[model samples]
Target chain A: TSSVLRSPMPGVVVAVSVKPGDAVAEGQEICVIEA
Target chain B: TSSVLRSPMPGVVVAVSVKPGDAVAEGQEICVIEA
Candidate 1:
Protein backbone atom coordinates (compact mmCIF):
# COMPACT_ATOMS: atom_id res chain seq x y z
CA THR A 1 0.00 0.00 0.00
CA SER A 2 1.05 3.57 -0.57
CA SER A 3 2.05 5.73 2.37
CA VAL A 4 -0.22 8.49 3.60
CA LEU A 5 1.13 12.06 3.70
CA ARG A 6 0.25 15.01 5.90
CA SER A 7 1.44 18.43 7.03
CA PRO A 8 3.00 18.83 10.47
CA MET A 9 1.14 21.99 11.36
CA PRO A 10 -0.64 25.14 10.18
CA GLY A 11 1.48 28.03 8.99
CA VAL A 12 2.67 30.18 6.12
CA VAL A 13 5.05 28.88 3.51
CA VAL A 14 8.13 30.86 4.38
CA ALA A 15 10.59 28.91 2.30
CA VAL A 16 10.91 26.07 -0.18
CA SER A 17 14.11 24.41 1.04
CA VAL A 18 14.58 22.15 -1.94
CA LYS A 19 14.41 22.03 -5.69
CA PRO A 20 13.11 19.58 -8.23
CA GLY A 21 16.66 18.53 -9.16
CA ASP A 22 18.46 18.62 -5.86
CA ALA A 23 19.30 15.77 -3.53
CA VAL A 24 18.26 15.92 0.11
CA ALA A 25 19.18 13.99 3.24
CA GLU A 26 16.89 12.32 5.71
CA GLY A 27 15.60 14.65 8.49
CA GLN A 28 16.75 17.57 6.43
CA GLU A 29 14.48 20.54 6.16
CA ILE A 30 12.56 20.12 2.93
CA CYS A 31 10.79 23.39 3.51
CA VAL A 32 10.30 25.85 6.31
CA ILE A 33 6.64 26.56 7.01
CA GLU A 34 6.55 29.50 9.34
CA ALA A 35 3.61 29.85 11.69
CA THR B 1 27.10 32.45 -1.07
CA SER B 2 23.94 33.58 0.68
CA SER B 3 20.97 31.36 1.45
CA VAL B 4 17.84 32.00 -0.58
CA LEU B 5 14.50 32.10 1.23
CA ARG B 6 10.97 32.56 -0.11
CA SER B 7 7.25 31.67 0.02
CA PRO B 8 4.82 34.55 0.02
CA MET B 9 1.59 33.16 1.46
CA PRO B 10 -0.11 31.19 4.21
CA GLY B 11 -2.71 28.42 3.91
CA VAL B 12 -4.01 25.03 5.04
CA VAL B 13 -1.95 21.99 4.14
CA VAL B 14 -3.95 19.28 2.46
CA ALA B 15 -1.06 16.80 2.25
CA VAL B 16 1.94 15.39 4.02
CA SER B 17 5.28 17.18 4.12
CA VAL B 18 8.01 16.19 1.74
CA LYS B 19 10.82 13.94 2.95
CA PRO B 20 14.30 15.06 3.95
CA GLY B 21 15.89 13.58 0.86
CA ASP B 22 13.73 15.77 -1.34
CA ALA B 23 15.22 18.64 -3.28
CA VAL B 24 13.59 22.06 -3.08
CA ALA B 25 14.29 25.64 -4.10
CA GLU B 26 13.00 29.16 -4.47
CA GLY B 27 9.34 29.59 -5.49
CA GLN B 28 8.85 25.84 -5.17
CA GLU B 29 6.40 26.00 -2.26
CA ILE B 30 8.40 23.70 0.05
CA CYS B 31 5.40 22.69 2.03
CA VAL B 32 1.79 22.22 0.92
CA ILE B 33 1.27 23.71 -2.50
CA GLU B 34 -2.19 24.87 -1.55
CA ALA B 35 -3.69 28.20 -0.65
Candidate 2:
Protein backbone atom coordinates (compact mmCIF):
# COMPACT_ATOMS: atom_id res chain seq x y z
CA THR A 1 0.00 0.00 0.00
CA SER A 2 1.00 3.58 -0.61
CA SER A 3 -0.23 7.15 -0.43
CA VAL A 4 -0.54 9.66 -3.23
CA LEU A 5 -2.26 12.92 -3.94
CA ARG A 6 -3.31 13.49 -7.53
CA SER A 7 -4.45 16.87 -8.70
CA PRO A 8 -7.94 16.98 -10.09
CA MET A 9 -7.67 20.05 -12.31
CA PRO A 10 -5.44 21.50 -14.99
CA GLY A 11 -2.54 23.23 -13.28
CA VAL A 12 1.14 23.86 -13.11
CA VAL A 13 3.72 22.00 -11.04
CA VAL A 14 5.52 25.06 -9.86
CA ALA A 15 7.69 23.32 -7.30
CA VAL A 16 8.67 19.86 -6.19
CA SER A 17 10.14 19.43 -2.69
CA VAL A 18 10.88 15.70 -2.58
CA LYS A 19 13.13 13.24 -4.29
CA PRO A 20 14.14 9.59 -4.04
CA GLY A 21 14.08 8.26 -0.45
CA ASP A 22 12.98 11.49 1.17
CA ALA A 23 11.23 11.08 4.49
CA VAL A 24 7.67 12.32 4.71
CA ALA A 25 5.10 12.69 7.46
CA GLU A 26 1.45 13.62 7.60
CA GLY A 27 0.56 17.06 6.12
CA GLN A 28 3.93 17.69 4.52
CA GLU A 29 3.73 19.47 1.16
CA ILE A 30 5.03 17.43 -1.72
CA CYS A 31 4.54 20.06 -4.37
CA VAL A 32 2.94 23.34 -5.31
CA ILE A 33 0.50 23.48 -8.22
CA GLU A 34 -0.91 26.61 -9.77
CA ALA A 35 -3.85 27.18 -12.05
CA THR B 1 1.73 26.58 -40.22
CA SER B 2 1.53 24.66 -36.87
CA SER B 3 -0.55 24.15 -33.79
CA VAL B 4 -0.73 22.21 -30.53
CA LEU B 5 -3.48 20.73 -28.49
CA ARG B 6 -4.26 21.37 -24.88
CA SER B 7 -6.62 19.50 -22.67
CA PRO B 8 -9.36 21.56 -21.12
CA MET B 9 -9.34 19.54 -17.93
CA PRO B 10 -7.19 17.29 -15.77
CA GLY B 11 -6.26 13.94 -17.34
CA VAL B 12 -3.59 11.32 -17.76
CA VAL B 13 -1.50 11.15 -20.90
CA VAL B 14 -1.60 7.46 -21.60
CA ALA B 15 0.17 7.59 -24.93
CA VAL B 16 2.34 9.97 -26.90
CA SER B 17 3.18 8.86 -30.43
CA VAL B 18 4.64 12.04 -31.83
CA LYS B 19 8.26 12.99 -31.49
CA PRO B 20 10.61 15.55 -32.94
CA GLY B 21 9.83 16.14 -36.62
CA ASP B 22 6.85 13.84 -36.56
CA ALA B 23 4.31 15.11 -39.07
CA VAL B 24 0.90 15.59 -37.48
CA ALA B 25 -2.42 16.92 -38.70
CA GLU B 26 -5.26 18.46 -36.77
CA GLY B 27 -7.20 15.97 -34.64
CA GLN B 28 -4.42 13.49 -35.27
CA GLU B 29 -4.32 11.97 -31.85
CA ILE B 30 -0.75 12.30 -30.73
CA CYS B 31 -1.79 10.68 -27.49
CA VAL B 32 -4.68 9.40 -25.50
CA ILE B 33 -5.55 11.40 -22.39
CA GLU B 34 -7.86 9.85 -19.88
CA ALA B 35 -9.79 11.80 -17.31
Candidate 3:
Protein backbone atom coordinates (compact mmCIF):
# COMPACT_ATOMS: atom_id res chain seq x y z
CA THR A 1 0.00 0.00 0.00
CA SER A 2 0.96 3.64 -0.47
CA SER A 3 2.29 5.77 2.36
CA VAL A 4 0.24 8.33 4.25
CA LEU A 5 -0.09 11.88 2.83
CA ARG A 6 -0.02 15.09 4.85
CA SER A 7 -1.20 18.71 4.40
CA PRO A 8 -0.98 21.66 6.78
CA MET A 9 -4.42 22.99 5.84
CA PRO A 10 -6.74 23.76 2.94
CA GLY A 11 -5.27 25.44 -0.15
CA VAL A 12 -5.24 25.90 -3.91
CA VAL A 13 -2.88 24.37 -6.45
CA VAL A 14 -0.47 27.26 -6.96
CA ALA A 15 2.14 25.13 -8.74
CA VAL A 16 3.07 21.56 -9.43
CA SER A 17 6.51 20.87 -7.90
CA VAL A 18 6.95 17.43 -9.39
CA LYS A 19 6.60 16.18 -12.94
CA PRO A 20 5.48 12.82 -14.28
CA GLY A 21 9.09 11.53 -14.36
CA ASP A 22 10.34 13.01 -11.11
CA ALA A 23 11.26 10.88 -8.08
CA VAL A 24 9.81 11.69 -4.66
CA ALA A 25 10.85 10.53 -1.18
CA GLU A 26 8.73 10.00 1.91
CA GLY A 27 8.75 13.70 2.87
CA GLN A 28 9.42 15.24 -0.50
CA GLU A 29 7.31 18.19 -1.62
CA ILE A 30 5.21 17.03 -4.50
CA CYS A 31 3.26 20.20 -5.35
CA VAL A 32 2.70 23.68 -4.03
CA ILE A 33 -1.05 24.08 -3.52
CA GLU A 34 -1.82 27.49 -2.06
CA ALA A 35 -3.79 27.82 1.13
CA THR B 1 -5.79 31.49 -20.78
CA SER B 2 -5.49 30.33 -17.17
CA SER B 3 -4.86 32.45 -14.11
CA VAL B 4 -1.73 32.65 -11.97
CA LEU B 5 -1.22 30.01 -9.25
CA ARG B 6 -0.12 30.54 -5.64
CA SER B 7 1.29 28.32 -2.88
CA PRO B 8 2.13 29.23 0.73
CA MET B 9 4.95 26.67 1.06
CA PRO B 10 4.95 22.94 0.21
CA GLY B 11 3.65 19.62 1.50
CA VAL B 12 2.41 16.13 0.62
CA VAL B 13 -1.08 15.17 -0.62
CA VAL B 14 -2.80 14.10 2.57
CA ALA B 15 -6.19 14.11 0.81
CA VAL B 16 -7.76 15.16 -2.46
CA SER B 17 -10.49 17.76 -2.06
CA VAL B 18 -11.69 18.02 -5.66
CA LYS B 19 -12.51 15.38 -8.23
CA PRO B 20 -12.15 14.99 -12.01
CA GLY B 21 -15.53 16.64 -12.73
CA ASP B 22 -15.31 19.28 -10.04
CA ALA B 23 -15.60 22.96 -10.93
CA VAL B 24 -13.19 25.42 -9.35
CA ALA B 25 -13.48 29.21 -9.13
CA GLU B 26 -10.72 31.81 -9.10
CA GLY B 27 -9.89 31.46 -5.38
CA GLN B 28 -11.73 28.26 -4.65
CA GLU B 29 -9.97 25.29 -3.04
CA ILE B 30 -9.25 22.54 -5.52
CA CYS B 31 -7.39 19.64 -3.93
CA VAL B 32 -5.37 18.87 -0.83
CA ILE B 33 -2.15 17.78 -2.59
CA GLU B 34 0.27 18.69 0.15
CA ALA B 35 3.91 19.60 0.41
Which one is best on TM-score? Answer: 2
Q: Cα miss at B24, model 1 (Å)?
A: 16
Candidate 1 chain B, run of 10 with poorest lDDT? B1-10
Query: Tens-digit lDDT track for model 2 on A1-35?
Result: 23324443344445444443445444444444444
Clashing pairs in 3: A5-B14, A12-A34, A14-B6, B10-B35, B11-B34, B11-B35, B12-B34, B12-B35, B13-B34
Per-residue lDDT of A1-35 in model 1, one digit per residue for the tens? 12222334544555555554343333444455443
| Model 1 stretches astray by more than 4 angstroms | A1-5, B1-35
Off by over 4 Å in 3: A3-10, B1-35
Q: Model 2 - which docking category? A: incorrect
Task: Give candidate 3's TM-score.
Answer: 0.35
Cα-lDDT of candidate 1: 0.40
Candidate 3 lDDT, B1-35, residue by residue in tens: 23333333444444444443334444454334333
Clashes in model 1: which pairs? A5-B16, A6-B16, A18-B23, A18-B24, A18-B25, A19-B23, A19-B24, A19-B25, A24-B21
Predicted candidate 1 versus true structure: per-residue lDDT over B1-35, tens digit per residue:
22323333333334444444444333443344233
TM-score of each: 0.39, 0.46, 0.35
